[PDB]
Amino acid sequence: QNTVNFTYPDFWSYSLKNGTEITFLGDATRIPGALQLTKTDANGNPVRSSAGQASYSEPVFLWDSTGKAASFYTSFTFLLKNYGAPTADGLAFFLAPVDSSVKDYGGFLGLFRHETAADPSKNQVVAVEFDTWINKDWNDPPYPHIGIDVNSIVSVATTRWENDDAYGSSIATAHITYDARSKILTVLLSYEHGRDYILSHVVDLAKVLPQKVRIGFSAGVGYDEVTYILSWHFFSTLDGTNK
Amino acid sequence: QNTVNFTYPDFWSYSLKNGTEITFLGDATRIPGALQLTKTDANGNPVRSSAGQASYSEPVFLWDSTGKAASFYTSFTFLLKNYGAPTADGLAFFLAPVDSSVKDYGGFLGLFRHETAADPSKNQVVAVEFDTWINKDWNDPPYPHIGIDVNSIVSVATTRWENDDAYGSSIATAHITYDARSKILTVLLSYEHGRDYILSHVVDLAKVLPQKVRIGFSAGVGYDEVTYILSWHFFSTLDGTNK
Ligand SMILES: *[C@@H]1O[C@H](CO)[C@@H](O[C@@H]2O[C@H](CO)[C@@H](O[C@@H]3O[C@H](CO)[C@@H](O)[C@H](O)[C@@H]3O)[C@H](O)[C@H]2NC(C)=O)[C@H](O[C@@H]2O[C@@H](C)[C@@H](O)[C@@H](O)[C@@H]2O)[C@H]1NC(C)=O
Ligand SMILES: *[C@@H]1O[C@H](CO)[C@@H](O[C@@H]2O[C@H](CO)[C@@H](O[C@@H]3O[C@H](CO)[C@@H](O)[C@H](O)[C@@H]3O)[C@H](O)[C@H]2NC(C)=O)[C@H](O[C@@H]2O[C@@H](C)[C@@H](O)[C@@H](O)[C@@H]2O)[C@H]1NC(C)=O
Ligand SMILES: CO[C@@H]1O[C@H](CO)[C@@H](O[C@@H]2O[C@H](CO)[C@H](O)[C@H](O)[C@H]2O[C@@H]2O[C@@H](C)[C@@H](O)[C@@H](O)[C@@H]2O)[C@H](O[C@@H]2O[C@@H](C)[C@@H](O)[C@@H](O)[C@@H]2O)[C@H]1NC(C)=O
Ligand SMILES: CO[C@@H]1O[C@H](CO)[C@@H](O[C@@H]2O[C@H](CO)[C@H](O)[C@H](O)[C@H]2O[C@@H]2O[C@@H](C)[C@@H](O)[C@@H](O)[C@@H]2O)[C@H](O[C@@H]2O[C@@H](C)[C@@H](O)[C@@H](O)[C@@H]2O)[C@H]1NC(C)=O
Ligand SMILES: [Ca+2]
Ligand SMILES: [Ca+2]
Ligand SMILES: [Mn+2]
Ligand SMILES: [Mn+2]
Known part of the structure; x- marks a missing residue:
C-alpha cells in the first residue's frame, strides 16, 4: 500500500x-480527548523547558526513484492554551526521517538541536x-x-499571526496541502468566528527528505503554554506521477 | 474598506x-437553500444548453500600484447533481472584471465566448x-x-477528478487560497467520507486581472446536470504587502 488515509474526528x-497508531516522544502524552504536546503539572498547568512529539506510527511514502511522488493534505484542530501573553514557544506539524526523535525544547520546537539549528546541511x-x-x-x-x-x-517564509489569535486560546483548524507536481506547500489556518491565514511556498519535498518519513506534531516550551491536538486527518495520493 | 470578509453557512x-448581496446572471437563480447555477424545468430536471452565474455584488480589491495585494481564502460546499454518467459541463469559481457578464454555455462554463476561448489576449x-x-x-x-x-x-494545470466523485452527486467542500506574496493559488476539494484533491499552481493575479474584480460561481451545460452552491465563505487580507 503506497498511500495513506486516516481520520481521527476526536481523541476521546x-x-x-x-x-500502535500514534507514537508519543519526550513529554508528549495522550490524555482524554487530545494529544498533549508538552508537560503539565498535577493541575494541568504548563511546566517550563519541555519538548514532545506525537507522530503517526507507520512510515509515510513521499517519493521513489521511479518518478512517483505523493501529494497530500492534512487537517487538524488544536488548542494552544495560553496563560497570559505572550507565551513560548509554539508547535509545528512536520515531516522528518522515520528514525528521528524529539530534540531541543524552547524555540527549536523539539525539531532541532541548538548546535545545528541554523545549518541546512545538518538537518x-x-x-x-x-x-x-x-x-x-x-x-x-x-x-x-x-x-x-x-x-x-x-x-x-512566514506570515503574521495576530496576537489575539496566537495568545487567544481558541480552537483553530489548520489545513496543509502539498502538490507533488508543482512542488507547492500551502498552509491555511482558520478560527471559527475570526480570520484566516494563508502561506504558500514552493518547496520540493523530494530534494530535501528521504523516501519514507514520519509525520506528526512537535512542540517546545517555553512558558505559560501547552498545545492539545484535538483531531487529525491525513490523506496522500500519487495522482499525476505516472502511477 | 480595502478587504472583504463574509460567511453564508447556508442559503435558507x-x-x-x-x-444586494449576491447577483444572479443568465439562468442562475436563488432557490430555498441554494444558488442554482443553471436552468431546470418544473420538476427540477436539468435543461440543456444553459449558463448562469452567481457572484458577490460588491467589487473585490485585488491590488493597486502601491504594492498592496490581497491574499484570500474562499470555501464553499456544492452539490453537483448528476442524472446518469457522464454529464456536462461543470462549474467554476472565478475572478473576472467588475463589468463582465455570463458568456457561452456548454464547455465554456459561461466564462468564455466560443470565438476567443483559446486566446489569452482576449480574456x-x-x-x-x-x-x-x-x-x-x-x-x-x-x-x-x-x-x-x-x-x-x-x-x-489540472488534476484527475475521479468518476465516482464527479458523477456521484454527493456534497463536496472546496477551499481555494491565494497567497499574494508567493503568487500561489491552491485548490482543495474534499468529500466527507472519501478522498481529497489538491492542485496548486503559481499564478500572479496582479499581472492578469484588474485592480478590482467580481468573484463568483459560473456554470454551463451541457446535459443531465445542475449545480447548487450550498454555502460560501470568503476572506481577504493585505498582510505582508507594506500595509
Ligand atoms: C513510546 O514508544 C517510544 C519507542 O517506540 C518511546 O521512545 C523511546 O524511548 C526509549 C527509552 O525509553 C529510547 O531509547 C533509549 O535510549 C537510551 C539512550 O539514549 C538508552 O539508555 C535506553 O536503553 C533506550 O535505548 C528511544 O530512543 C525512544 N525512541 C525514540 C524514537 O525516540 C517513547 O518514550 C518516550 O519518548 C522517549 C523519547 C523518552 O523521552 C521517554 O522518556 C518517553 O517515555 C514511548 N512514549 C511513552 C509516552 O511511553
Ligand atoms: C440581477 O440583476 C442583473 C443586473 O444587475 C441582471 O442582469 C442584467 O440584465 C439586463 C437585462 O435584463 C442586461 O442589460 C440588458 O442588455 C440588453 C442588450 O444586450 C438591452 O436590450 C437591455 O435594455 C438591457 O440593457 C444587463 O447587461 C445584465 N447585467 C449583466 C451584468 O449582465 C440579472 O438578469 C439576469 O441576467 C441577465 C444577464 C439576463 O440573462 C437576464 O435575463 C437575467 O434575468 C438579474 N437577475 C435576475 C435573476 O433577475
Ligand atoms: C538567561 O539564560 C537563558 O537564556 C535563554 C535565552 O534568552 C532562555 O531561553 C529562551 O527563553 C524564551 C522564553 O523566555 C524562549 O523559550 C526562547 O525560545 C528560549 O531560547 C531558546 O532556548 C535557549 C535555551 C537557547 O538555546 C536559545 O538559543 C533558544 O533560542 C533561557 O530560558 C529558559 O529556557 C528556555 C528554553 C525556556 O524554557 C524558558 O522558559 C526558560 O526560562 C534562559 N534561562 C533562564 C532565564 O533561566
Ligand atoms: C453536433 O452539433 C453540436 O456539436 C457540439 C460539439 O460536439 C455539441 O456541443 C457539445 O456538447 C457536449 C455534450 O454532449 C458538451 O456540452 C460540450 O461542451 C459541447 O461543446 C461545446 O459547445 C458547442 C456548442 C461548441 O461551441 C463547442 O466548441 C464547445 O466545446 C452540441 O450539443 C448541444 O450544445 C451543447 C452546448 C450542449 O448543451 C449539448 O447538450 C447540446 O446537445 C451539438 N448540438 C446538437 C447535438 O444538437
Ligand atoms: Ca520562535
Ligand atoms: Ca470540459
Ligand atoms: Mn519562527
Ligand atoms: Mn477542462
Missing part, C-alpha cells in the same frame, strides 16, 4: 497503546510552525507568525 | 433581492473549474478534472 478513545526536516515567541537570535520576524521551515529553524 | 434565507479571467466533460477540441485531459484557468478555457 484514549486507551490505545503508545506506538532533514520540513515543518509548518505556529511560532508564539520572537527569538531575535534565530531570525524570527517581530511578531507571532506561521512559518515554513526547510532543514532549519529559520523559516524560508 | 432566500428572500434577498437580486443584486481577463482566472477560474478554478470542476470539469465533468471531455472537450477533445479544447484540450481537456481524458477524464473529469479540476483545473486552473488563466485567461483561457485551456487550463494551465
